[PDB]
Structure 1
Amino acid sequence: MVYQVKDQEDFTKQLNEAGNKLVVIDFYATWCGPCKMIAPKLEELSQSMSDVVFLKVDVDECEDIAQDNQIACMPTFLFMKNGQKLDSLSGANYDKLLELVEKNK
């Protein structure tokens, strides 16, 4: 599953429940074509990879979280572990997403 982050403290709650697991966060908008195209692939990946936590942040609903992470393109995938940033990817390139999750998991 891909869990939808509700607000700043909810994002922190999720980053903790992840324990030591890689967390992949998709920053998206509902008006954005490339975001809608890749969303189902992220959902398929999340059902299989139970040792990675997948989250999503709607930038219109969570403008403060978007500003905290310096988002400018969408989708942007942020890679985190233990509350700390590992890597980011801008755009819907599913092979680069898979490479980054392989690298970081």
Structure 2
Amino acid sequence: MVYQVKDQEDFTKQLNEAGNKLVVIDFYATWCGPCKMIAPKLEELSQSMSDVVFLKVDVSECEDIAQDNQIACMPTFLFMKNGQKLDSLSGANYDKLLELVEKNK
């Protein structure tokens, strides 16, 4: 399952709970058509990659988190591991997302 971040406290807790796992953070908005289309694909991916943590951030409800990460395009996937940003993908391209999870996990 992809965990919906409520706020900064929740986000920080999830990042700490991930330990040394790759974290994929889906920054999305409900006005973003492709975000809603890729969402079910991300849910399935989170079931098949148990070693990866999948989070989602509704930028309309978590504006501070969005701007801290200089998000511009919907969706944006951030790839994090051990507190470092490794990669970023703008757009709802699932095949590229899968490629980046391999390049980085």
TM-score range, shorter chain: over 0.9
Provide the rounded CA distance (Å) in 1 between the counterparts of 2:78 and 2:89. Answer: 7
| C-alpha contact 1:22 1:52 (8 A) present in aligned 2 | yes
Deviation sequence 1:12-47 (CA, Å, 0-9, x none): 111111011000000000111010010010000001
Task: Give 5+ residue unaligned stretches, structure 1.
Answer: none
- The percent identity for this pair of structures is 99
Q: Which runs of 4+ in 1 moved over 2 A?
A: none
Provide the C-alpha distance between the structure 2 equivalents of 1:17 and 1:7, rounded to a whole number of angstroms. 15
TM-score, length of structure 1 as denominator length:
0.97
The Cα RMSD (Å) is: 0.6
| Cα offset, 1:48, TM superposition | 1.0
TM-score by structure 2 length? 0.97
Structure 2 matches for 1:48-67, cutoff 5 A?
48-67=48-67
* Residue correspondences, number: 105
Deviation at 1:84, TM superposition (A): 1.6
SS of the aligned residue for 1:23 comes to strand
Q: Is the 8 A contact 1:15 1:82 kept in 2?
A: no
